Design a protein around this nucleic acid. Sequence first.
RNA 1: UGAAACUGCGAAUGGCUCAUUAAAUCAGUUAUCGUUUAUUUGAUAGUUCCUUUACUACAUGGUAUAACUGUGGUAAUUCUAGAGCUAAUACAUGCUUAAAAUCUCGACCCUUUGGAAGAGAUGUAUUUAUUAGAUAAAAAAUCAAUGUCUUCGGACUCUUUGAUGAUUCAUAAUAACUUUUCGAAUCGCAUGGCCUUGUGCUGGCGAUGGUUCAUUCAAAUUUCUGCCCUAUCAACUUUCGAUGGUAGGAUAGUGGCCUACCAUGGUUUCAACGGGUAACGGGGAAUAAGGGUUCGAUUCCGGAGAGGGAGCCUGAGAAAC
Lengths: 226, 142, 260
Amino acid sequence: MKLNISYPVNGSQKTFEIDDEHRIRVFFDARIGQEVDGEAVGDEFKGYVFKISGGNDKQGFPMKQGVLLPTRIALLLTKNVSCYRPRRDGERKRKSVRGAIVGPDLAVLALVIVKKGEQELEGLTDTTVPKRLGPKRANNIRKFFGLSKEDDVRDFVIRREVTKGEKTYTKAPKIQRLVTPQRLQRKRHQRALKVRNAQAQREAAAEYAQLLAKRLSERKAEKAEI
Amino acid sequence: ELTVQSERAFQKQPHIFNNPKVKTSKRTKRWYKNAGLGFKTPKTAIEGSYIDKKCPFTGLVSIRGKILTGTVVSTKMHRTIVIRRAYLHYIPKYNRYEKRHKNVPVHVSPAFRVQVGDIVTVGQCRPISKTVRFNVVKVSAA
Amino acid sequence: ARGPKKHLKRLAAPHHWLLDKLSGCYAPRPSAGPHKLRESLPLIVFLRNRLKYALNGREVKAILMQRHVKVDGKVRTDTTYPAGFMDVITLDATNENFRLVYDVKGRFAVHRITDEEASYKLGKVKKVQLGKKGVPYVVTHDGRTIRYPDPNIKVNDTVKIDLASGKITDFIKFDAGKLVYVTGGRNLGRIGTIVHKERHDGGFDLVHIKDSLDNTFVTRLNNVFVIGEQGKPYISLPKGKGIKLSIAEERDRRRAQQGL
RNA sequence: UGAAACUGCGAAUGGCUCAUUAAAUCAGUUAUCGUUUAUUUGAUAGUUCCUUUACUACAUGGUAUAACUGUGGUAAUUCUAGAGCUAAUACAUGCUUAAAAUCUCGACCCUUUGGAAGAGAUGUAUUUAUUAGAUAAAAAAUCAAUGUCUUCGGACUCUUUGAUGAUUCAUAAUAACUUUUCGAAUCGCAUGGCCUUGUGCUGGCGAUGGUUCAUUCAAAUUUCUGCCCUAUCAACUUUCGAUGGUAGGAUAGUGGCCUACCAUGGUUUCAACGGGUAACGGGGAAUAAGGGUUCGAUUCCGGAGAGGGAGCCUGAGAAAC
């Protein structure tokens, strides 16, 4: 072999296998992607520019842009490194990976594609699939449907129909960031809480200073006299 | 000894300054202190050239908690000694005591010149060695 | 055993908390108090095993939640708030006002006060430092942190604050003839004199006192808390003034008082 | 309505069992000013971009794939491979913001007891210096930078100050630090204020996150004081860590934990080290005048194993059986 194709631009994708072996010879070492062509790979692919991606080997373990080997290995992984998932803030496990350098031992790999070729494929090149979700910060949306910085979005905000069958309802986002006559109010409540505090300490500081000094001043008729 | 550098490494009581540019009279400093706890801070301390950090008075070791003695037993260590404390203990059964003793490892400064036999008060430092804890503070000769 | 303990085996709770001995495997304990752990309390005790105002402990979460009891004029909705000697605990339902302070016997006590008097408290002074930007400050057994204060104030007295504010109204001194409540030690739960500190100096300072019946005595400097000049004792004091009785006397007053 | 699966959190409890273990487990108290802490409970982040007049989507951006499909291999096992697909609170990013304060530059003016437009940083978690962080009581000078008012001789008058038995703590303050932690691209139910009538300006309740800080259920290590039989066991340990120093690595931390160099110490007839134990400890059970003698593998509290031995993946939480 299956292959695991992913034409981005539209977003699609598909699964065409090759099961011939002499039209297969290729990919067989160019590590992860080092562009594999698509004339000796399959002639539904022709001038197609098939980046190698990565994907699964057999018995069937992950492949890793890192391993430097067509071998089968079993290093220590980390919350960070992928091949892996950490089941604990601060924890590490041993597993296996047949490395990024291809060879026959594969059920699957990925073809993601750069410059599509002359020849037409069906259910990637054909079919699309949405733009699935949608952005957020308006300032991403001026990046998206502009908004005329000033006129403000609210307006062309992205949303969705959605069906009770008989009473469709309009589920919608929540921005975050949005400068209000709330938000500002808090820059706000802060500054005058900065100043507020300050005219307090300055004042004590001195009121102590002169109170300490209605004494040290009297320290002096506090000798000769009482 | 007595000659002060001797310990390749040079010596000084840390944070002390003297001022080869500026009129110098007295040339040297010192830093000293006064233990405390009813003591007397002798004069071979504010006089004595020597260095030793582990000095009570000429250096950076505090004295807190025991105050105790006794009878010196051996001195053979380059600035450190040993004490006995022959004590008594009351077995509840034969209703009578025994002469028991523990020995004690302690630092010591050149300010005191102790032979064996002498009665001797001591303090109790942070820790100062592997064993080692107390610092002599007052000798009690013949 | 590795970090610090987070539980408290009942038995191990202090014996004046007076806690049962059965049913509750576990007592509490208090978390990170402005108080000291042992000579203190939680409201989870003071609000079922003492007063009544709870039945369960679930019930005692439910009175607090409601933000309906203020310690030192401030809410708390801990459940094991580490309250102590000197405190305010105000009842919002109820103007009902308890100053924590020991029995005579030995206790804690249940002492009502004078919605006026919740007002202030008797800040102990526990140390003194020019601290941080070069500013002096006293830090109060209440585990509480007080700034720009006068220099006349020294090491070992109180200072009336205002709860509403952390002011430092009036301070008292430590001198051969002032009243003294004894905080902790056989004599906790008594007043009240300073006959004579007995300096020394590692450390151990010692004190002499007497009382209203002329009995006397000698305890640690540590465990002393001035309150006023003989008279005006800056409170109130619970019954029996806080007095001590050769049980030869106590038995009597329960024989005097046989009435039902 | 809901099979399956994508994430989520569970499985580290619980049950059994006692072989090992003799100052070790363990009981009674101690400490955390020696550390980590899923949740649960309570407080909690307007200065995110970017040299900021024609800005980055925030009316919400993009990858990939499980299931499912179909084409399979093997005697065989909870075996998987190569293909066309599709979502997330998966996977990865990246806007949103107020007023203020404050700091370090200084275009110009003016030689004064030196002012100045606007230029950026300050949001938080990181790292590291350094400073404050006062206060056991009352009083004379010169400054070295000049903080407040000029009665144009100077002053400085009420000047802030938390806890601790105890700190370098608690938090703040500067100069930079970081393969930059976070600051909501969610979600079910109600769905209505008013217009400047775009299905817009604005609006309930509730969830699931989530940065910290306390908390809390904890763990870890930890003082003291306590063990049965043996001298036909009287001297032990420092091969190579035995006992301390100093510094680093190590840890969630402390500490010969381990290593660099150093010093020669620490235990011992008041029974150490060795040998035995058909020893897991205790609460307690039998016996029962008093004092006692034996037994507590076993219904609760600790610890230890998972057939021996080791090492480690996940997760806060395992040396897991």
